[PDB]
Design a protein. Structure first.
Lengths: 348, 348
């Protein structure tokens, strides 16, 4: 047998030499060099020491600042809140495991690492649709006087906070199970085994379409509608109104965010799709570790985006960090506001 | 001429098109694309966001835990400080410099953006010698009844602070000078021009020898000593005493800590050396930017190593972070330390 299936796991290592042991009961150093595990352990650390201050940062700002209440603004708060969970929710454990060399918390732990990770990523994928929608509703405006209010925004927050939930939820209650991958440090869905007990079989097809293929379309498609309308080409202050040229930046951002997704996941979705269609092939632990751990940057490449492609936010952020005011720079140029300082509304 | 020497600088760009401007008076966007500076800018931000908590933490931790008082718990405590100094020291500036495309604070900026760096950079180097020796004195144990006291650790500290100071402070008072390098976002010593009025020539030698090659001897050699004695080959509980065992851990580390140095500084020291031995050839802004900005990771790659190759420190940290205690993990299986908990004195 190429790998070693346990009733709880599947080590991508042959037990010909009888050296394989449950990733729930002992270090997996026989899978790779111990310094290699120290490697994963640091990586995560950085992630935790980074993705934390930054995402927290975000929350605390949006909260404080009163004008930051646009769709985009509502989506990116979520993301920050989802990511705050991955980190404290599961990234922390992955570190634990890494620092030990195996899931010491056994299955409860893998159910953490797995759950959160899955959810947070699904949410990120879904949020990328609640967006395509809006982007379409503002660029191709199929309406007359319909505006995407904060109310429609909180809807998505629920929509996504649920759709992505009915994804990382089942493997915790009979439908599918979470199982360690690569060097047994990370946890994911079970692609490796058929395990009729939980029909890992059905659950995987359910997600390769209803939680991937579909959202992929929905987004790519909407990206087609705004092909003739707003494009990448966006001139200086205004293009048919600075309001029309300011929306083309919320759009030149969203695109990128999506890229940052199909780079953070396809490399993995591909690996996971190859292992499913070949549940037994001769693949090694390094095979799924790299594409998997790489996808964990997911918890950080979003605020960076938004903090570089959102004059509004970025300015409003430095205002928060410079304690008092000192907007310096060249302000948002357009709207600005905060908790009280420049929070003054000037709408209609 | 291949570059544009100014009375205060040296832009690695030809002024044949008369487009070159003082990096103390105008943006250097003609040297590279404006988004690249944005990169440096973005990057600089990630460094500060990570390096602060990580270094601040380490500080408050070494202080609260009354037993973390080994020479190592001194050299790194002093090492984390030297980094906080770089971070707020010149890291802040340099970001501000990348943000506005040029050294707005003129030379003043260049001097801090360049001092502190040279400062801490050296301390981390010297801090490695003050570690190599100590490692020698315990592994090849030169005395028959010697042991470094807290006083000695403070001597090293005072020492590395003198040695490093003895080379970062001179360029502030007439011997050589800090001049911006690469894209003109960072400052360093002058290898570029001979400037007789300041003696760049002489200094640069005094640095490549009395502060690099020689310390690079006092260390590698010392290692060739702990080759026959304590070796990277570290087993489990006890080696000839669980004491001798854990002695091996503090070494596998120092070694790594020395790797994480030659990695972070040779690529730069190399570039720096080539230029010197070619004060006038043709090289571009990117040339020294890369080695240079990568070297700045020196402000973090230490605590991460420490907090990973030190079960006791890691645990004291988990103990601290988990507000109360409950060091979960695996503890150190050996000694522990803190303030009111189990910082209980347990000698002989
Ligand atoms: C790969 O191939 C190996 C060689 O064929 C095979 O080896 C067997 O490994 C199992 C454990 O994985 C060994 O059984 C253990 O024996 C010890 C006695 O030294 C027991 O303590 C242990 O159970 C304990 O139960 C306690 C109560 O629950 C608990 O407190 C303890 O912590 C512990 O769980 C097991 O009984 C067995 O002797 C090995 N046999 C041989 C031939 O060496 C590997 O299992 C196999 N690995 C795979 C398939 O993943
Ligand atoms: C590269 O070649 C450029 C053209 O030779 C040259 O431009 C010159 O720059 C100086 C700036 O110091 C200008 O001088 C001005 O100085 C002050 C301004 O505050 C005033 O006395 C005057 O306005 C004065 O013009 C020169 O006018 C300008 N000459 C030009 C454009 O022809 C750059 O300085 C060169 N880059 C270098 C060597 O750093
Ligand atoms: C163990 O792994 C090997 C390598 O992946 C598997 O061998 C492949 O089997 C398929 C179908 O039988 C062939 O089409 C491939 O050509 C084989 N690969 C090669 C070239 O070696 C093998 O089937 C696996 N055995 C188990 C445990 O199922
Ligand atoms: C400008 O740079 C070029 C290339 O970096 C220099 O040309 C080199 O000159 C040295 C002698 O100083 C020769 O050994 C090399 O073979 C030359 N290479 C090339 C590409 O010609 C040139 O000297 C520099 N000009 C100055 C002096 O500023
Ligand atoms: C370290 C974290 C890991 C390996 C996280 C695992 C996350 C999942 C199993 C997520 C799954 C999917 C998506 C995010 C997009 C849609 C398709 C899935 C089901 C492969
Ligand atoms: C962004 C930070 C920078 C450019 C830091 C600059 C640091 C130096 C100029 C350091 C120089 C050297 C050492 C630390 C060791 C000894 C040899 C030198 C002179 C190349
Ligand atoms: C971030 C620096 C850590 C990554 C470099 C690996 C260095 S090495 C690694 O260190 C572990 C802890 O001491 C040991 O248990 C293990 O045997 C050893 O190979
Ligand atoms: C976008 C990245 C998608 C990656 C999917 C390509 C899987 S490629 C697959 O890997 C196996 C295990 O190493 C090999 O044994 C096999 O020969 C190779 O073709
Ligand atoms: C201290 C927070 C670091 C985040 C970096 C934000 C850079 S912000 C940038 O600054 C330029 C000049 O100062 C302005 O002209 C521009 O409008 C502003 O958006
Ligand atoms: C790892 C230490 C790095 C050693 C530094 C190597 C400097 S090498 C130098 O780089 C110039 C770039 O403009 C080239 O034009 C030139 O031909 C090349 O020899
Ligand atoms: C030893 C490990 C090296 C680890 C390194 C770095 C991990 C962190 C940074 C992630 C930032 C990604 C940026 C988003 C750009 C879109
Ligand atoms: C032998 C190697 C020691 C290696 C150590 C790892 C310690 C790592 C931190 C590097 C800082 C990375 C910064 C992210 C900025 C994006
Ligand atoms: Hg779209
Ligand atoms: Hg990514
Ligand atoms: Hg604001
Ligand atoms: Hg040594
Ligand atoms: Hg480094
Ligand atoms: Hg401790
Ligand atoms: Zn079962
Ligand atoms: Zn989902
Ligand atoms: Zn199947
Ligand atoms: Zn002069
Ligand atoms: Zn020095
Ligand atoms: Zn010279
Ligand atoms: Zn532990």
């Amino acid at each position: 047998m190429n790998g070693t299936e346990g009733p709880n796991f599947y080590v991508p290592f042959s037990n010909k030499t009888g050296v394989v042991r449950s990733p729930f009961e002992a270090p997996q150093y026989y899978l790779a060099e111990p310094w290699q595990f120290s490697m994963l352990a640091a990586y995560m650390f950085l992630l935790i020491m980074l993705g934390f201050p930054i995402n927290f940062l975000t929350l605390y700002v949006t909260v404080q600042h009163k004008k930051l209440r646009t769709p985009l603004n509502y989506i990116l708060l979520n993301l920050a809140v989802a990511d705050l969970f991955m980190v404290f929710g599961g990234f922390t454990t992955t570190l634990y495991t890494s620092l030990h060399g195996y899931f010491v918390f056994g299955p409860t732990g893998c159910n953490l690492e797995g759950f959160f990770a899955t959810l947070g990523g699904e949410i990120a994928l879904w949020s990328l649709v609640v967006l395509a929608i809006e982007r379409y509703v503002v660029v191709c405006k199929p309406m007359s006087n319909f505006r995407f209010g904060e109310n429609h925004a909180i809807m998505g927050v629920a929509f996504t906070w649920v759709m992505a939930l009915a994804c990382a939820a089942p493997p915790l209650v009979g439908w599918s199970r979470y199982i360690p991958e690569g060097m047994q440090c990370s946890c994911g869905i079970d692609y490796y085994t058929p395990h009729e007990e939980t029909n890992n079989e059905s659950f995987v097809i359910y997600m390769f379409v209803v939680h991937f293929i579909i959202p992929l379309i929905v987004i790519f498609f909407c990206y087609g509608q705004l092909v003739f309308t707003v494009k990448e080409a966006a001139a200086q202050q205004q293009e048919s109104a600075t309001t029309q040229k300011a929306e083309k930046e919320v759009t030149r951002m969203v695109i990128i965010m999506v890229i940052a997704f199909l780079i953070c996941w396809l490399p993995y979705a591909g690996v996971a799709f190859y292992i499913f269609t070949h549940q037994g092939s001769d693949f090694g632990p390094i095979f799924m570790t790299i594409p998997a751990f790489f996808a964990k940057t997911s918890a950080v490449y979003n605020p960076v985006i938004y903090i570089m492609m959102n004059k509004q936010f970025r300015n409003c952020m430095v205002t928060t960090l410079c304690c008092g005011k000192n907007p310096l720079g060249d302000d948002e140029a357009s709207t600005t506001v905060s908790k009280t300082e420049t929070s003054q509304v000037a709408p209609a």
